[PDB]
Structures are given as C-alpha cells and as structure tokens.
C-alpha cells in the first residue's frame, strides 16, 4: 500500500483537500489508504470514500458509454471497417473501470462490512456493494453476468431489509439506497415495474414522515425525494 506510511488523519485531511481541488483519483487513493488502516470509518469518512469512488467510476462509465456507442455505430450495416481500435480502447476503459470496482468491493469485503454493526454504517456499505456490482453489471457480457447482477441484487436487498427495520423512511441513506435499487431494477434487471413501484412507495412513505423532521433534516430528505420524483417522471 503506497499510503501505508501516511498517518490516518493526514490521509483524511488530504482526501478533503483533494475533494476541494476536484482531484477525485487522489481523493480515492487517500481514502483507500485510510480504510486500509483497519479502523472503522465515521459517517463523514464514509461520505468521503463514497464521493471519491463515485466520481472516479462515474467518469469511467461516461467514457465507456461514449466508446460503446461509437463501437455500436461502427458495427451497423454500411459502416466502414476501421479495425480493432475502437473495441480495444473501449476494452481498455472497461478493464480500468472493472479494476476500480474490484478495489471498492475489496475494501467493503476486507473488512468494512463485517465490522459495520450500526444501520447507518452497514446499510451504507451494503448499498455501495450493490452499486459497484451494478457498475460491473453494466459492462458484463460473459458467463458470470447473471451472478454479477445477483450479487448486486443481494447486497441491495440486505441493505433494504435492514433500512426498513432500523431507519425512518426519511433517512437519506435509506432514501438513496431505494433510489439506486430502483435504478438497478429499471436498467439492470429489466424490471421497470419494480423500479417504479419502489420509487413511488419510497417517495410516499418519506412524504408522510417529513412532519417529524427539523428544517435541516427536511432539506436533506426532500433533496433525495426529488431525485425519486425525477426518475419517476423519466419513466412514466
């Protein structure tokens, strides 16, 4: 581990600086180093880990989609053969993306999830596990595609089960989990009805719990509720 010689607190501090500088690859490397110290993460540190890798893999996904579109257009009838290069470069980006997903899943398995006992930590990490298997599923085509999809589903389902027992319906982690599992249903599992039902029920149950919240909690929860509504509008 190239961060092995850096203090945990210094890694966290530099992750925050890297975020301010929009240096998300550095931020992810610092947070990987922090996780590898072996101590549990705080709520804020979980956010730093998630933001870093979400931005890294999000950029990879966007690039993969551009390249995969070009590759598709080059395979249609009437397109001029341009050689192996588009496929090769799409594969290069894909392999890098898969490497990042493997890294995140590795941190979750060794050993974040097994030490996470509170709902706010355990649901967060299980949601992340679902997310990174979902990103692997977006690019998968081989013998293990169904197993990858099922690994995402299983992680999301365990997170959902805990969140419904242990968190109020407005908790932002519970809401974000439902948002993302709904997207999984729609985009990965070919289950648009489940996606829509989950988004609607999540939204409605959150609405009915807003009255219990402070102004600041209300702002946090309604922000994610609007994302649920946005997706419902896209899908209906």
């Amino acid at each position: 581990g190239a961060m092995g010689s850096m203090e945990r607190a210094s890694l966290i501090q530099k992750a925050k600086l890297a975020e301010q500088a929009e240096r998300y690859e550095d931020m992810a490397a610092f947070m990987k180093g922090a996780v590898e110290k072996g101590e549990e993460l705080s709520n804020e540190e979980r956010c730093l880990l998630s933001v870093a890798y979400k931005n890294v893999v999000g950029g990879q996904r966007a690039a993969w989609r551009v390249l995969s579109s070009i590759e598709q257009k080059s395979n249609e009838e009437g397109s001029e053969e341009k050689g192996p290069e588009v496929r090769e470069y799409r594969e290069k980006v894909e392999t890098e993306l898969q490497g990042v997903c493997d890294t995140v899943l590795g941190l979750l398995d060794s050993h974040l999830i097994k030490e996470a006992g509170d709902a706010e930590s355990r649901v967060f990490y299980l949601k992340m596990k679902g997310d990174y298997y979902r990103y692997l599923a977006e690019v998968a085509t081989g013998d293990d595609k169904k197993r990858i999809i099922d690994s995402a589903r299983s992680a999301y389902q365990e997170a959902m089960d805990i969140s419904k027992k242990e968190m109020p319906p407005t908790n932002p982690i519970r809401l974000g989990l439902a948002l993302n599992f709904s997207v999984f249903h729609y985009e990965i599992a070919n289950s648009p009805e489940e996606a829509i039902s989950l988004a609607k029920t999540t939204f409605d149950e959150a609405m009915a719990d807003l009255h219990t919240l402070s102004e600041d909690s209300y702002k946090d929860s309604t922000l994610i509720m609007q994302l649920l509504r946005d997706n419902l509008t896209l899908w209906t």
């Binding site: 997310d131 974000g176 948002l179 993302n180 997207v183 994302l227 899908w235």
Partner: peptide, 5 residues
C-alpha cells in the same frame, strides 16, 4: 440517465 447517489 436516471439519478443515483
């Protein structure tokens, strides 16, 4: 693409 967090 749909929203995720």
């Amino acid at each position: 693409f749909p929203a995720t967090v």
